[PDB]
Enzyme design. Structure first.
Site, short mmCIF file in Angstrom:
data_model
loop_
_atom_site.label_atom_id
_atom_site.label_comp_id
_atom_site.label_asym_id
_atom_site.label_seq_id
_atom_site.Cartn_x
_atom_site.Cartn_y
_atom_site.Cartn_z
N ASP A 68 -1.10 -12.72 12.22
CA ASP A 68 0.06 -11.80 12.03
C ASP A 68 0.24 -10.91 13.31
OD1 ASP A 68 1.82 -10.13 11.18
OD2 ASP A 68 0.57 -9.15 9.58
N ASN A 84 8.98 -7.31 5.52
CA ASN A 84 9.17 -8.06 6.77
C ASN A 84 10.55 -7.91 7.33
OD1 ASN A 84 8.46 -9.90 9.04
ND2 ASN A 84 6.59 -10.17 7.72
N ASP A 87 34.19 -19.21 6.58
CA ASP A 87 34.17 -17.75 6.34
C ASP A 87 33.93 -17.43 4.89
OD1 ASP A 87 34.65 -17.30 9.09
OD2 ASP A 87 36.70 -16.46 8.77
N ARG A 138 0.77 -1.26 0.00
CA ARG A 138 0.00 0.00 0.00
C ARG A 138 0.80 1.30 0.00
NH1 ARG A 138 0.49 -1.84 4.90
NH2 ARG A 138 -1.05 -3.58 4.90
N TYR A 185 21.42 5.13 11.90
CA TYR A 185 21.89 5.06 13.29
C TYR A 185 20.76 4.65 14.23
CZ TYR A 185 25.31 7.77 10.78
OH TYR A 185 26.17 8.12 9.76
N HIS A 218 22.19 -4.68 -1.70
CA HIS A 218 22.46 -5.96 -2.36
C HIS A 218 22.24 -5.75 -3.85
CE1 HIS A 218 22.27 -10.32 -3.06
NE2 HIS A 218 22.42 -10.53 -1.76
N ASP A 252 7.60 -14.48 11.02
CA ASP A 252 6.27 -13.84 11.10
C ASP A 252 5.25 -14.97 10.89
OD1 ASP A 252 4.33 -12.03 11.51
OD2 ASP A 252 4.88 -10.72 9.81
CA LIG Z 1 17.63 4.57 12.90
CL LIG Z 2 7.82 -14.92 7.71
ZN LIG Z 3 3.62 -9.37 10.62
ZN LIG Z 4 1.43 -7.26 9.43
#
Ligand SMILES: [Ca+2]
Ligand SMILES: [Cl-]
Ligand SMILES: [Zn+2]
Ligand SMILES: [Zn+2]
Ligand SMILES: *[C@@H]1O[C@H](CO)[C@@H](O[C@@H]2O[C@H](CO)[C@@H](O[C@@H]3O[C@H](CO)[C@@H](O)[C@H](O[C@H]4O[C@H](CO)[C@@H](O)[C@H](O)[C@@H]4O)[C@@H]3O)[C@H](O)[C@H]2NC(C)=O)[C@H](O)[C@H]1NC(C)=O
Ligand SMILES: *[C@@H]1O[C@H](CO)[C@@H](O[C@@H]2O[C@H](CO)[C@@H](O[C@@H]3O[C@H](CO)[C@@H](O)[C@H](O[C@H]4O[C@H](CO)[C@@H](O)[C@H](O)[C@@H]4O)[C@@H]3O)[C@H](O)[C@H]2NC(C)=O)[C@H](O)[C@H]1NC(C)=O
Ligand SMILES: *[C@@H]1O[C@H](CO)[C@@H](O[C@@H]2O[C@H](CO)[C@@H](O[C@@H]3O[C@H](CO)[C@@H](O)[C@H](O)[C@@H]3O)[C@H](O)[C@H]2NC(C)=O)[C@H](O)[C@H]1NC(C)=O
Ligand SMILES: *[C@@H]1O[C@H](CO)[C@@H](O[C@@H]2O[C@H](CO)[C@@H](O[C@@H]3O[C@H](CO)[C@@H](O)[C@H](O)[C@@H]3O)[C@H](O)[C@H]2NC(C)=O)[C@H](O)[C@H]1NC(C)=O
Ligand SMILES: *[C@@H]1O[C@H](CO)[C@@H](O[C@@H]2O[C@H](CO)[C@@H](O)[C@H](O)[C@H]2NC(C)=O)[C@H](O)[C@H]1NC(C)=O
Ligand SMILES: *[C@@H]1O[C@H](CO)[C@@H](O[C@@H]2O[C@H](CO)[C@@H](O)[C@H](O)[C@H]2NC(C)=O)[C@H](O)[C@H]1NC(C)=O
Ligand SMILES: *[C@@H]1O[C@H](CO)[C@@H](O[C@@H]2O[C@H](CO)[C@@H](O)[C@H](O)[C@H]2NC(C)=O)[C@H](O)[C@H]1NC(C)=O
Ligand SMILES: *[C@@H]1O[C@H](CO)[C@@H](O[C@@H]2O[C@H](CO)[C@@H](O)[C@H](O)[C@H]2NC(C)=O)[C@H](O)[C@H]1NC(C)=O
Ligand SMILES: *[C@@H]1O[C@H](CO)[C@@H](O)[C@H](O)[C@H]1NC(C)=O
Ligand SMILES: *[C@@H]1O[C@H](CO)[C@@H](O)[C@H](O)[C@H]1NC(C)=O
Ligand SMILES: *[C@@H]1O[C@H](CO)[C@@H](O)[C@H](O)[C@H]1NC(C)=O
Ligand SMILES: *[C@@H]1O[C@H](CO)[C@@H](O)[C@H](O)[C@H]1NC(C)=O
Ligand SMILES: *[C@@H]1O[C@H](CO)[C@@H](O)[C@H](O)[C@H]1NC(C)=O
Ligand SMILES: *[C@@H]1O[C@H](CO)[C@@H](O)[C@H](O)[C@H]1NC(C)=O
Ligand SMILES: [Ca+2]
Ligand SMILES: [Cl-]
Ligand SMILES: [Zn+2]
Ligand SMILES: [Zn+2]
Lengths: 696, 696
Positions: free
Chosen positions: B333, B465, B612, B156, B218, B635, B399
């Site tokens: 959720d 997320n 590593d 949204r 920060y 990335h 989640d």
């Molecule tokens: Ca911050």
């Molecule tokens: Cl998740």
């Molecule tokens: Zn959530």
């Molecule tokens: Zn949510």
């Protein structure tokens, strides 16, 4: 035994002398065939000396060269436009080199082309405070004027940036004998002073750590996408050219307008040092005209990269790097350093041939295009930045081994202070009068620390050399060491023949170090440091030394702010968070030191954990967002000074937010930014401390 | 034995059910007292369950809440200014909760205040292509109009950004039954569909990875310096408010102007779906008026951070994190995920109490303020970024455990594909019809990979997320898994009761997972992954799987560009460097895999070296300069889509340079930037490959 003693005893003064002579017979200007030949030679020798691999790493970067059929020069021009006086087209070559070809004439690398004509203003050293004094106190306006500035005090790129922002249309740089002629010493060839025809070459970029102007952030490899010239980093917008003091006398002798504001503005030539603008009445109608025709051109450069694979931790790199390109013969800069590196490689390879290998991998580098903006080191580091930031233990620089014959000079991270103290106590002083005494003893006597007493001076790293990408961009612990002059009893800048055709093998062998004993001492300091870094079971860094200096820098920056007590009240400007973080750093570092002493010495994972905490401690002071408008200066504790690339500034983000703050028109905004930089610094200090806490 | 089986067998469906009920009796809105209480409870329980330490990490971040004495609502207003129709002030509470207090009414978090009045335009899903169609094809101008958009298809916040750039003065969001009412299923409480009074809460920021709007880069700690609201990151400039489909019917039924351009613009309500602007003739003079009075306020949030110290590599972190704050009761959720994490912690702590410890350190997190922009995870990661980037092995998100009951869904880095394949072959399918078969078998059957056959679908990570800071900012290998619906036979978005008051414990126990067997399966997948990551001697990542997907993404982005063959000719646009880098990556990764197979298994430094290289491989795809105008998306292979935060885009820098390029007015500049992004991607791929080469 194959120990550090075996390594150090193998180093020979006579070998450094042979290599210096070999490296300084012809010019090795970056981008030229002669410098590619020398790269190939060093590559072959390092292979013979025993390294495991030795490769050339090349890049295509923006370089700058005069036009050989259209020479640069400056004129005084009369009312008709006749050129009544012309500056030299070349430096008189030294004895026995008058037939060497391909000596590049004096020029300012990266100057744009132009033929600007105008009245002179004399701007002293063209420092930020010189322009403040001219503009604010003397009400002299440089807009549309040609400025003349004496070399010295600050990096020349900062002079040009400062003239450009004052609205100059050109800059003439010259060497004043006040700053480049030591009293009582003769001019080259009869001593080490700069003759009146001598001229200092050098680039005038303001790269702020970017490397190649056309490819900031990425290596200038074969498929690189390049910025257009107009979007290039760091190029000057006004023509610039350097001259010697014979020529400077002719441009300065006629100057009118205001008197110099005081004696700190007067050099040693027999002229008044009037600021101008323009010439006195009789000549008020003559002007100065520059003729600059140099071109910028993308050109291939070559680094030599040698590897000596570690026996135990091959994925940990200790790097000994210095450049190979020179302005002309490079007798001091850089070949006195390159010869020292060559002998270090030889000594390591001797031990290797007998079956030894260091604990960690040692990388040796012969960088190209340092004189054109640290281009070779920076492009290689951009290419290899992931390997360096996860594997880089330390970088030791190796430019000029000598700039005097008085005592040692070391600039490095606090993490190396203890290593340097300990190594120098085990080395012999080369100084007359200290026969049988340690280098530590002679160094501490001749160069006492301002803070400590019984300790030697060790300076913070500034910039203007190839450690910049490793230290201020990537956060790898870095250091440099050389022999230097006594700065007390000497008013001149660096060494007088810097970046002149007169910097030759003879200068060194006759006047600086005829026995090569200072060179040998420097090879022992540089090589001894690389040895201990690459071989000590526990990395030889003492975090507690960073804690001590962080307190000193916090006191210093708070003292600066406290010149403005009313504003600190109005805007609620507190340094409490920064002092808190420095206190915590001191406490955590003390506890970590105890564990490092007391940890179970048989456990290698514990050992690798604590070595990683040591390696990544310098790394923790990096802010990935960089400093304001200087994205490649990411270390929060140290940046090159915004007014002088050669000098280091501590807490640079807070320093620049405070600088000249009483002149800002929106004080609320300005002090807001001071508070922002305090928050960033306190945060970074605490975050670095926490990397030394127990890990879980 | 203390092995993965012991861990997996200890997990109980009945425990996840008990915890879900315990976590969903009252609302746990971020920044409220109830959610601080729950944090304290989880902290105490994780301590009892056996973790070594469990601490709260708090921050003060910008949150947003309606004004309880000045409610948000929307009107139709007549010519006199009488409000003839008002939207609801609250959702009808579900059975037995009609007396719960502190249910936050539906609102759009971070909307500015305002009471804009105007004519409606209906913009379908307010996607980039919806506005293209309106503006370019239909010539409808949204400037100064209130837009109404149906929820679905994209995040949204991207709808609001797109309306704002079209010049809207307000946005109304609503849930169409086409997208939130599954055919043949009843509305809550009698089934899992959204009732006409149901409304979806959610924030409407465009943070692009920044975290707290006021402190980008920060942690929002006690001394943080905050931006002023006007310089805050990601806040919308126009008021926004969500409604249900009863209310939406009343706003849409009177719409005039143009017909919908085709059937993909029509939802399921009994209205024409005219685009407008404004209402039909009889009502042409009525307008729509929003009344928004919510306030943004800096508010304390609390993460719970539990540590289980590793026996062998305590300085290597495997992180299991999911949030705890909910919009109301959080039945799905996030508490269906939080209950699964709670049971995983319990199972690990059981083993620990019997003397076991994982090889590496496991960190467990209960994040706060996820619903307000991933604030808790992001501020903690900003605080701890140095530890995470040098020590972070992997992040597994936790989640919602379910969004359907059909089959498994996994989105993760290619580095985890093999680990997920292998683990799921050892787990029992919970599906009816696959009794006694593996989870791998049922998953592959119900969700076949588009590419492979005999393999299951695994999606790239998008965003929306708490893994975003770990994966796209910091470059730590990340994954997520849950049970999901059959997307084929279902046209609706996510699950219908998303972010509504109707998402309760009852919804889950009655309609989604009455036996808690899908929850248990998800606890086994998440917990099994954390187990293998924290315990396998060699990290369980297969670099060769990244090589395969990099080729797929290179083919895809080249195919996009090749829709413009004339321009690729004119501007010399070649993908050769990117294919070269992908080829090299494939070759080097194949050789590294052989060494990993064949290395001397007794040598732990060799082992730590190669672990590593595995850990820092995801890290190598980070560009410290970030993507254009999105500095926290660093990335180079994966970023959240610029048109839809929930979706991942591959080679995002090249993708966005190509997007809509035929519309750019300076094609030379546009294709220049395409070439720049190809250079950046090829470089990054080659640099990541080189981290897998022999180290020296
Ligand atoms: Ca911050
Ligand atoms: Cl998740
Ligand atoms: Zn959530
Ligand atoms: Zn949510
Ligand atoms: C140096 O290290 C020390 C740790 O030894 C560290 O101390 C921490 O200081 C912060 C203050 O910045 C403390 O934060 C407090 O945390 C408590 C909860 O534990 C909160 O209730 C506090 O906020 C409320 O109360 C305050 C009154 O004390 C109010 O001033 C505030 O407005 C709120 O009402 C506050 O957030 C933290 O507890 C300690 N941590 C410890 C002792 O472990 C210090 O921060 C380090 N320095 C730096 C620069 O990081
Ligand atoms: C994938 O890995 C391969 C290595 O297996 C790697 O190949 C390298 O390719 C570059 C080309 O981009 C080569 O660069 C050349 O290097 C030679 C010196 O070794 C130069 O002389 C070349 O430049 C001149 O000559 C070229 C003709 O070939 C001209 O086109 C050019 O304009 C100059 O006149 C050129 O710079 C490099 O040698 C190889 N390295 C090898 C084989 O080891 C490739 O780059 C990797 N892909 C990526 C995207 O990194
Ligand atoms: C520079 O040299 C100094 C002096 O040798 C080094 O400091 C010394 O380091 C040793 C070796 O770790 C310390 O030994 C320890 O002593 C304690 C006894 O309290 C014991 O518990 C440990 O097992 C160990 O024996 C010694 O105390 C210390 N001396 C001083 C004055 O600090 C220093 O480490 C060297 N610096 C570098 C970078 O190598
Ligand atoms: C997922 O499971 C597969 C199948 O078990 C794993 O692949 C297998 O890994 C083993 C263990 O290293 C490989 O064994 C090796 O075989 C060679 C013989 O050529 C030998 O030289 C080595 O000493 C070792 O025994 C095995 O070949 C391999 N099987 C296949 C088909 O690749 C895979 O590693 C697991 N993935 C993860 C992330 O754990
Ligand atoms: C600098 O030293 C090198 C190495 O001794 C000299 O280069 C060698 O020259 C000999 C004789 O011409 C050749 O046979 C060798 O192949 C060269 N070796 C290498 C590795 O290049 C070089 O001539 C010396 N330069 C000066 C100016 O003295
Ligand atoms: C300074 O150099 C300039 C340029 O070479 C000299 O002026 C030139 O003189 C030549 C030969 O007489 C003329 O043909 C050119 O037309 C002149 N060029 C310009 C640009 O003026 C000048 O003579 C020199 N001045 C001194 C004192 O040596
Ligand atoms: C959720 O579970 C927790 C833990 O069992 C309950 O909190 C406990 O409540 C008992 C009885 O009131 C107290 O004596 C304990 O001290 C509490 N423990 C902790 C760790 O807080 C809590 O009441 C349950 N909540 C609901 C809604 O069922
Ligand atoms: C929609 O709500 C508004 C605001 O509560 C109602 O308009 C108000 O009505 C009250 C009571 O008659 C008046 O005293 C206020 O002056 C009105 N306020 C405004 C802003 O118009 C309106 O009656 C409601 N409409 C419907 C259909 O319920
Ligand atoms: C140098 O100057 C000459 C002649 O004055 C001219 O022909 C040539 O264009 C210039 N060369 C470069 C590289 O600009
Ligand atoms: C300096 O001179 C320029 C050029 O005419 C003028 O435009 C500028 O305002 C002057 N500044 C001051 C401070 O006199
Ligand atoms: C070498 O040292 C002597 C003795 O102090 C000094 O007089 C001379 O100036 C030095 N040479 C150089 C180049 O510094
Ligand atoms: C909420 O609205 C009330 C009354 O309408 C007002 O007094 C108060 O200022 C508002 N509260 C906030 C937090 O803005
Ligand atoms: C859309 O409407 C606004 C508001 O009057 C106007 O200024 C803008 O130019 C219009 N754009 C187009 C493409 O019609
Ligand atoms: C549970 O599964 C059944 C059988 O496929 C299906 O009809 C029902 O829709 C599912 N419930 C939910 C909430 O998806
Ligand atoms: Ca570059
Ligand atoms: Cl140096
Ligand atoms: Zn140099
Ligand atoms: Zn130099």
């Amino acid at each position: 035994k194959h120990n550090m003693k075996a390594f150090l005893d193998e180093l020979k003064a006579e070998n450094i002398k042979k290599f210096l002579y070999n490296f300084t017979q012809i010019p090795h200007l970056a981008g030229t065939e002669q410098n590619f030949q020398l790269a190939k030679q060093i590559q072959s020798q390092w292979k013979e000396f025993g390294l495991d691999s030795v490769e050339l790493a090349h890049y295509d970067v923006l370089l700058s060269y005069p036009n050989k059929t259209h020479p640069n020069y400056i004129s005084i021009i009369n009312e008709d436009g006749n050129e009544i006086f012309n500056t030299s087209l070349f430096e008189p070559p030294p004895p026995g080199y008058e037939n060497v070809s391909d000596i590049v004439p004096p020029f300012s690398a990266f100057s744009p082309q132009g033929m600007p004509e105008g009245d002179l203003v004399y701007v002293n050293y063209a420092r930020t405070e010189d322009f403040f004094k001219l503009e604010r106190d003397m009400k002299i306006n440089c807009s549309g004027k040609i400025v003349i500035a004496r070399y010295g005090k600050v990096f020349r790129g900062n002079k040009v940036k400062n003239a450009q922002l004052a609205g100059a249309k050109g800059v003439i740089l010259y060497s004043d004998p006040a700053d480049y002629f030591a009293p009582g010493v003769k001019s080259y060839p009869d001593g080490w002073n700069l003759p009146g025809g001598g001229v200092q070459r050098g680039n005038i970029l303001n790269l702020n750590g970017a490397g190649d102007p056309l490819t900031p952030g990425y290596p200038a490899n074969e498929y690189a996408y390049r910025r257009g010239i107009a979007e290039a980093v760091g190029l000057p917008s006004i023509p610039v050219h350097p001259i010697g003091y014979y020529d400077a006398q002719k441009l300065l002798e006629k100057m009118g307008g205001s008197a110099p504001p005081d004696s700190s503005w007067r050099g040693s030539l027999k002229v008044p040092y009037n600021v101008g603008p323009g010439f006195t009445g009789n000549f008020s109608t003559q002007k100065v005209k520059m003729h600059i025709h140099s071109t910028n051109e993308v050109t291939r450069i070559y680094n030599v990269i040698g590897t000596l694979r570690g026996a135990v931790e091959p994925d940990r790199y200790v790097i000994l790097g210095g450049h190979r390109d020179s302005w002309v013969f490079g007798g001091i800069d850089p070949q006195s350093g390159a010869a020292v590196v060559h002998e270090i490689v030889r000594s390591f390879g001797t031990l290797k041939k007998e079956g030894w290998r260091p604990r960690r991998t040692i990388l040796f580098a012969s960088w190209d295009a340092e004189e054109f903006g640290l281009l070779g080191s920076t492009e290689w580091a951009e290419e290899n930045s992931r390997l360096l930031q996860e594997r880089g233990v330390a970088y030791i620089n190796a430019d000029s081994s000598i700039e005097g014959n008085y005592t040692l000079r070391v600039d490095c991270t606090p993490l190396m202070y203890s290593l340097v103290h300990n190594l120098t106590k085990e080395l012999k002083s080369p100084d007359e009068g200290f026969e049988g005494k340690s280098l530590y003893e002679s160094w501490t006597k001749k160069s006492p620390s301002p803070e400590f007493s019984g300790m030697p001076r060790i300076s913070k790293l500034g910039s203007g050399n190839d450690f910049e990408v490793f230290f201020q961009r990537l956060g790898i612990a870095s250091g440099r060491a050389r022999y230097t002059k006594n700065w007390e009893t000497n008013k001149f800048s660096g060494y007088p023949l810097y970046h002149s055709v007169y910097e030759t093998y003879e200068l060194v062998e006759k006047f600086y170090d005829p026995m090569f004993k200072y060179h040998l001492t420097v090879a022992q300091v540089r090589g001894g440091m690389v040895f201990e870094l690459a071989n000590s079971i526990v990395l030889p860094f003492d975090c507690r030394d960073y804690a001590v200096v962080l307190r000193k820098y916090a006191d210093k920056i708070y003292s600066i702010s406290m010149k403005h007590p009313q504003e600190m009240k109005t805007y609620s400007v507190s340094f409490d968070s920064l002092f808190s973080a420095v206190k915590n750093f001191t406490e955590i570092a003390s506890k970590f030191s105890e564990r490092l002493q007391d940890f179970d010495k048989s456990n290698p994972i514990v050992l690798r954990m604590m070595n990683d905490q040591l390696m990544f401690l310098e790394r923790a002071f990096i802010d990935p967002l960089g400093l304001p408008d200087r994205p490649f200066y990411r270390h929060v504790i140290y940046a090159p000074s915004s007014h002088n690339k050669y000098a280091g500034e501590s807490f640079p983000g807070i320093y620049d937010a405070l600088f000249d703050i009483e002149s800002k028109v929106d004080p609320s905004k300005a002090w807001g930014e001071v508070k922002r930089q305090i928050y960033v610094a306190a945060f970074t200090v605490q975050a670095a401390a926490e990397t030394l806490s127990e890990v879980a």
